[PDB]
Amino acid sequence: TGIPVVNDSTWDSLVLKADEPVFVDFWAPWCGPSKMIDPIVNELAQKYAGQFKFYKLNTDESPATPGQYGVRSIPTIMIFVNGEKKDTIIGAVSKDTLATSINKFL
Ligand code: NA
């Protein structure tokens, strides 16, 4: 069980057109550090429920969006507000690092 998925088909409607700030987790199953963040992304999604949307994009399954947005390594977190990219947090970082960035858009 984890956060909902976004893919290339739904990127515009779920991320760019969202009512709420959005946290996006770029990950892939070949990258173990990008999977090891799932418990703290899930903790964040529960804590921030109703203030942020949370989605994960599998760069193996949805290659167009990471290509377009210049993703070079995973995990990569991006935050969007009203259609605008507001932050990028690259690499397997602490929950506190992520909460700092999330709270900036609260
Ligand atoms: Na909340």
Curated annotation (Swiss-Prot):
One of its GO terms (biological process) is negative regulation of catalytic activity. The active site is at 31 (nucleophile), 34 (nucleophile). The record marks 25 as: Deprotonates C-terminal active site Cys. One of its GO terms (cellular component) is chloroplast stroma. Its main location: plastid. Residues 1-106 form the Thioredoxin domain. GO terms for molecular function: enzyme activator activity; enzyme inhibitor activity; protein-disulfide reductase activity; salicylic acid binding. Thiol-disulfide oxidoreductase involved in the redox regulation of enzymes of both reductive pentose phosphate pathway (Calvin-Benson cycle) and oxidative pentose phosphate pathway. Under reducing conditions, activates the glyceraldehyde-3-phosphate dehydrogenase and the phosphoribulokinase, and inhibits. the glucose-6-phosphate dehydrogenase. Activates NADP-malate dehydrogenase. Belongs to the thioredoxin family. Plant M-type subfamily. This is Thioredoxin M1, chloroplastic.
